[PDB]
Amino acid sequence: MAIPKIASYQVLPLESFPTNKVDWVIDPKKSVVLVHDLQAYFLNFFDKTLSPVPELLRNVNKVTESARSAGIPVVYTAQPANQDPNERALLTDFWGVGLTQDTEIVPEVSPQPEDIQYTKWRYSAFKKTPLLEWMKEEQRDQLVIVGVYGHIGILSTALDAFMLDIKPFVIGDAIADFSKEDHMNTLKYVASRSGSVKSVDEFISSVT
Amino acid sequence: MAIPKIASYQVLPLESFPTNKVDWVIDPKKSVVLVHDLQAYFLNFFDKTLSPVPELLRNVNKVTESARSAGIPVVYTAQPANQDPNERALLTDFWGVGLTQDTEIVPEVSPQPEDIQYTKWRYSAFKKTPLLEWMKEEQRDQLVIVGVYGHIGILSTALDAFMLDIKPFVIGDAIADFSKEDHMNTLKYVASRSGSVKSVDEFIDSVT
Numbered sequence A: 001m002a003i004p005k006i007a008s009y010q011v012l013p014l015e016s017f018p019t020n021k022v023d024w025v026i027d028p029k030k031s032v033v034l035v036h037d038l039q040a041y042f043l044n045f046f047d048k049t050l051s052p053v054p055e056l057l058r059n060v061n062k063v064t065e066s067a068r069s070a071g072i073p074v075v076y077t078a079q080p081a082n083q084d085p086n087e088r089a090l091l092t093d094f095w096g097v098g099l100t101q102d103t104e105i106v107p108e109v110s111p112q113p114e115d116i117q118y119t120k121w122r123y124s125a126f127k128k129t130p131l132l133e134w135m136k137e138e139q140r141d142q143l144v145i146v147g148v149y150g151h152i153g154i155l156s157t158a159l160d161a162f163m164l165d166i167k168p169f170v171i172g173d174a175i176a177d178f179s180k181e182d183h184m185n186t187l188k189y190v191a192s193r194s195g196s197v198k199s200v201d202e203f204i205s206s207v208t
Numbered sequence B: 001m002a003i004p005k006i007a008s009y010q011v012l013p014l015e016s017f018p019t020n021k022v023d024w025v026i027d028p029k030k031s032v033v034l035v036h037d038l039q040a041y042f043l044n045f046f047d048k049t050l051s052p053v054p055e056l057l058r059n060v061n062k063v064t065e066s067a068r069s070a071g072i073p074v075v076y077t078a079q080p081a082n083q084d085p086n087e088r089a090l091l092t093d094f095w096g097v098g099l100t101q102d103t104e105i106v107p108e109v110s111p112q113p114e115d116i117q118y119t120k121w122r123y124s125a126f127k128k129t130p131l132l133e134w135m136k137e138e139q140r141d142q143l144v145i146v147g148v149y150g151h152i153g154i155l156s157t158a159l160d161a162f163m164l165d166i167k168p169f170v171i172g173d174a175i176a177d178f179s180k181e182d183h184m185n186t187l188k189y190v191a192s193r194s195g196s197v198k199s200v201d202e203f204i205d206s207v208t
Helices: A053-069 A091-095 A131-137 A150-163 A180-193 A200-207 B053-069 B091-095 B131-138 B150-163 B180-193 B200-207
Strands: A031-036 A074-078 A116-119 A142-148 A167-176 A196-198 B031-036 B074-078 B116-119 B142-148 B167-176 B196-198
Touching: A031 A053, A031 A150, A053 A074, A053 A142, A053 A167, A053 A200, A142 A150, A150 A167, A150 A180, A150 B150, A150 B180, A167 A180, A167 A200, A180 A196, A180 B150, A196 A200, B031 B053, B031 B131, B031 B150, B053 B074, B053 B142, B053 B167, B053 B200, B142 B150, B150 B167, B150 B180, B167 B180, B167 B200, B180 B196, B196 B200
Parallel strands: A031 A074, A031 A142, A074 A116, A142 A167, A167 A196, B031 B074, B031 B142, B074 B116, B142 B167, B167 B196
Antiparallel strands: none
């Protein structure tokens, strides 16, 4: 009903990432980076000075910097404050009325002027946003996903993308979750059923 | 890459169903039963004489028969043979070219003349089908889900339904999966993040 006070946990070692079942490789000419719901509201459920938040933010910055250097668009999603109950619909039964403040992107990974920002309404970044038709317009069919929370919005976004013929790449050391278990199980599900799991360094070397 | 030979396992005990976080009640005036992908092709991956397939088929029949007695529409989904690779898209990377035969619903749960049958293209029964707009036409906003496989199509259909303002009810003893673990984890995920988990008897009692 409430997002938990998330206890600190260690970013999983890269050697523990689950093995990919598909062999897609991130292509700078075909990819978009999604910074998923990195709002103050959602990150304040962690103690930000503790693992995995400093590493998460540094890794998100590594991703977006390499992305912009390679001409890869960066898209941020953010939930709006004070959502109309008709618009929020069944989310209220699970999570309450939703955030009423602290909607800003956390300052460490604040958007740059050329980045795109979409208003998010559901777990999946494709529902009620321009994301799908804009990616088609840009003729980019790869979505590189960073942010929070792994087993909820990241997972659901990966599953629409996959079903919408967009290749999702979840960056395993650039997401965070309710627990190390939720984080890992997110990666195991994606790698075996819905997309690709890559490291920050694999993204960087793929996009130079 | 190939659907495994699925080892037999026991239907999970009713006392082990996860507790629901929401208090939705199945209403015969607002509900639809979805029989998800109960095709010979998908069920032949199991030894159908062993649990959980006999219980699955007679529980699906219990559900659909009480549904029709209550005026609840029954919708079946079925994948078509020899899918166009351009239409099948990224499924091919994970699973191969897909079924080429054995497309019929298994005779134990064969559709009745009044039931609806849709051609299915993705994990979620909502993608590239009329299901969402037909439910809106019928003014029914509850989807009671039975069939296979739990962590793949059942889960994705429930997530899509939830995000599309349709309440999903997954019938825990009328689905089956790759393993007892996948089956349970499907129910735990739905009950905590995406819908309601009910038993066959709870459905029967709810729709009289």
